[PDB]
RNA sequence: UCGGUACGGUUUGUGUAGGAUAGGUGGGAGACUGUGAAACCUCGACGCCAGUUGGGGCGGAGUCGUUGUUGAAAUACCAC
RNA sequence: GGAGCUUGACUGCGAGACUUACAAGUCAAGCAGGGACGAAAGUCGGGAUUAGUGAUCCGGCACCCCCGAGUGGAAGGGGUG
């Protein structure tokens with residue numbers, strides 16, 4: 005307890021499941037009492053991640069963005085390096101960046117590379133292993149024309165990936181947004197998770213869902229009603 | 235109610251020797267089951283079904299989906315590579331080739347077509363974050379510090395018997411199968427590798443089976459005893475002091491029930507030999523009940539046991555074995571340094587020390603199979619030497635248990651007498667047509683009994699026991715130690731069993747090396763109980779750890 | 788003591804032949820080269 | 836009363852440098868108004884892998900973040 | 916009696932006989948497949964020969980994919996060992 009966490013706990017009921025809009029309504033009335041916040045959604049799936057064909061992994065583009073720094077490290081040499089900084093990449097990867105990441109400077113947020121210079125990716129993934137900032141072909145970060153996904157990672161392509169205990173974790177943007185802006189990222193997330201739903205999922209696929217702030221408690225939302233996120 | 239392994243009406247039998255018959259039990263995860271029973275009961279034949287190495291005759295036995303099975307065999311094999319290469323063939327075996335391809339695709343893809351190999355490295359680099367397999371250089375270096383493995387750069391052909399078992403446990407404790415199948419894990423392990431494995435199997439996810447004859451390891455790693463009598467399986471709970479109660483009770487209520495049946499045969503055999511009187515008939519419905527009682531009285535006739543019997547040798551002189559300033563080693567590492575002792579006449583001497591410290595090399599300088607560095611070994615004119623060995627090198631697998639003791643000969647020499655060979659091996663329990671089993675099908679508890687038949691027929695008055703208390707159960711462990719106390723010569727024993735040197739010892743030769751010497755020994759005059767009180771008064775009063783986790787998960 | 792073993796093929800696993808062996812003189816599974824009519828040629832045959 | 840299941844609170848994890856080693860994942864630059872170095876309390880949960888995770892006595896004077904690195908990984912706080 | 920290599924202790928058949936109330940029992944030249952030994956000729960469908968065994972029914976398992984109670988499947992049935 006903190007004698008202010010119980011103020012927001014006195015305003016949100018625990019047992020009552022809510023609509024996707026009332027979660028975004030109480031996203032404003034719980035987070036914004038404190039400082040700035042990012043809205044957190046935790047989803048417990050109905051899969052078992054021990055098997056191979058139940059590893060739920062995918063990405064989604066968000067329409068209203070997410071409001072973050074997005075320090076994208078695009079890896080390309082030659083004239084392809086200038087295409088990233090013209091597109092909006094602050095630090096463009098090269099060979100000199102390899103000798104300073106291995107020195108202990110890893111201040112970046114993603115890795116969008118080119119298929120010709122992937123030899124340096126396996127050497128730079130020494131310390132990018134447990135960090136999980138590998139270049140992924142399934143999220144479009146490994147592609148030939150790298151002049152597309154630079155502003156897309158800025159645009160809100162947050163990667164969701166199921167853990168060992170079958171718990172998705174995903175952000176739908178900052179807490180300084182509106183109710184019609186938050187619930188559409190909520191609607192675009194779940195509608196693309198169900199496309200990634202494996203065919204061998206026993207039982208109810210979407211068991212329990214919650215929405216939480218950065219300091220306050222979690223909002224129990226109803227997994228049953230998924231049609232009217234607007 | 236989710237399970238691991240289920241048996242349904244399993245019946246495995248090697249003909250007359252049944253192992254299972256109409257058995258059914260289920261294994262749930264988190265269970266800590268220790269399986270007990272006498273020697274030859276069938277304990278390793280159960281685990282060779284539960285690992286998928288053998289098939290039951292008429293039954294159903296299947297693992298649940300997922301949760302694979304790793305077995306420790308009773309004689310664990312290895313490969314002809316190094317130690318660091320001996321731990322990657324399992325535990326890292328399914329996952330190092332996914333790293334052997336990722337360091338290939340870093341260079342082979344850069345000159346070939348970069349469009350279809352994009353997902354070929356895609357579905358493998360995403361197999362290196364769920365397991366965190368980037369640290370495969372330094373996960374092996376943690377799993378060797380836990381078991382105190384040998385250094386990982388030398389071969390594995392010349393290792394101790396308890397050093398080969400440490401590198402075989404690392405092949406299974408890195409895999410982490412949810413159904414462990416440990417077959418006699420505390421063989422050849424010192425008092426540290428057992429105390430380590432008690433703590434590691436305490437907090438362990440998954441099901442653990444362990445066929446352990448010893449009384450104190452099963453009280454720490456098990457809480458649910460499974461038993462194998464003649465065919466049946468008796469699951470219950472307790473801590474192994476209740477197993478010897480119930481097997482003593484299951485034979486006292488079966489023994490006198492089979493004595494009431496014997497009196498009813500004598501009352502009925504007198505009726506079938508009494509003759510039919512005048513025109514009455516001897517009823518066929520009592521003849522047909524006699525010949526069913528007479529058939530159910532011969533099937534209960536399996537109650538016998540053979541004692542361990544050492545032949546006596548010639549008269550032993552005043553000088554048995556003298557060792558004066560012995561130095562012994564193989565490399566820059568020195569094992570034995572400046573040792574001076576002399577074996578007594580008519581006593582039992584115990585050799586005590588951890589694994590890989592120089593105990594089998596101490597015998598192999600005495601038997602004349604090594605050569606000392608400095609100092610000499612001196613025997614004497616009277617001593618005939620008899621030597622059992624740890625490796626069981628004399629017994630070959632593709633030759634029957636009879637014609638290894640003999641060589642197709644009828645009568646053998648057991649020291650100035652001629653006993654018949656089949657009469658000699660039947661004095662070692664191998665009776666009837668069990669004398670034609672080869673050495674590959676014998677159990678581990680009766681290769682520790684066959685090795686005593688090969689080497690005690692030398693009839694010597696100096697026997698060198700290199701771990702005889704290895705795979706023996708409680709009935710014949712007491713039969714061995716009662717044959718050493720009545721032995722007239724001198725017996726030297728290497729053993730790790732603390733409650734076996736405490737019972738039969740007169741002299742202790744124990745390793746006491748520390749950080750500045752690492753190669754010194756110590757001759758003590760007394761039993762094992764007085765050695766442990768002197769060990770805590772000379773070096774390190776009340777001083778003669780935390781569990782190394784083997785992994786970061 | 789002399790059970791009836793059956794000899795399954797090594798390619799197709801068909802059970803083409805049946806015969807007897809001694810269990811105690813031959814504890815392992817017998818291996819013979821026998822004609823397999825499905826394959827049309829001599830294959831190897833362990834037991835089951 | 837003794838159990839099962841569903842729901843929610845409190846609490847648990849310590850090879851090796853270290854804040855006895857957040858257990859996992861995700862969010863995160865703030866979180867409370869600060870003395871297990873406290874007054875009634877004061878490890879008499881566990882107490883061993885020993886001191887941080889309670890006996891919740893009170894006080895708006897008095898702990899801790901991010902940085903530093905010292906690591907497979909960190910540090911508050913919190914939903915998961 | 917001894918030694919070398921081996922699996923014919925074969926799959927598809929069978930002109931003609933013995934014996935015989937019937938049911939069964941027994942012998943078989945030779946033809947093709949794919950093999951073993953042999954330089955070849957050739958021999959090989961267990962053992963010098965005659966005992967070491969049990970009709971039908973009902974079932975079991977393996978394989979072949981023949982029938983599939985409106986249709987597509989399946990359950991069951993059928994063949995061959």
Ligand SMILES: Nc1ncnc2c1ncn2[C@@H]1O[C@H](COP(=O)(O)OP(=O)(O)O)[C@@H](O)[C@H]1O
Nearest residue numbers: 248273274275276277278279675676677678814
């Ligand atoms: N392959 C085999 N063929 C014939 N008999 C066997 C075979 N394997 C084991 N046996 C016999 O069955 C018994 C079962 O061995 P088992 O008790 O499983 O070994 P352990 O004592 O290690 O459990 C042995 O005593 C052996 O005589």
Ligand SMILES: Nc1ncnc2c1ncn2[C@@H]1O[C@H](COP(=O)(O)OP(=O)(O)O)[C@@H](O)[C@H]1O
Nearest residue numbers: 392393394395564589590591592593594595596
């Ligand atoms: N032939 C050999 N060459 C080199 N080193 C050996 C050889 N045989 C044994 N060693 C080493 O000697 C050490 C001690 O073995 P030792 O303790 O005598 O075996 P045991 O534990 O059976 O008594 C072992 O660590 C082993 O590495």
Ligand code: VO4
Nearest residue numbers: 394396422589590
């Ligand atoms: O490795 V040993 O148990 O023969 O000392």
Ligand code: VO4
Nearest residue numbers: 273677678679705
């Ligand atoms: O599992 V054993 O009875 O051969 O020691």
Ligand SMILES: [Mg+2]
Nearest residue numbers: 278308418678
């Ligand atoms: Mg065994």
Ligand SMILES: [Mg+2]
Nearest residue numbers: 395593594624
């Ligand atoms: Mg030894």
Ligand SMILES: [Mg+2]
Nearest residue numbers: 811812813814
């Ligand atoms: Mg033979």
Ligand SMILES: [Mg+2]
Nearest residue numbers: 805806807924
């Ligand atoms: Mg036949």
Ligand SMILES: [Mg+2]
Nearest residue numbers: 928929930931
């Ligand atoms: Mg005909």
Ligand SMILES: [Mg+2]
Nearest residue numbers: 947948949950
């Ligand atoms: Mg031909």
Ligand SMILES: [Mg+2]
Nearest residue numbers: 951952953954
């Ligand atoms: Mg030829």
Ligand SMILES: [Mg+2]
Nearest residue numbers: 944945959960
């Ligand atoms: Mg012919």
Ligand SMILES: [Mg+2]
Nearest residue numbers: 962964965966
């Ligand atoms: Mg005959």
Ligand SMILES: [Mg+2]
Nearest residue numbers: 970971972973
């Ligand atoms: Mg009938």
Ligand SMILES: [Mg+2]
Nearest residue numbers: 983984985986
């Ligand atoms: Mg139909």
Ligand SMILES: [Mg+2]
Nearest residue numbers: 989990991992
């Ligand atoms: Mg069918």
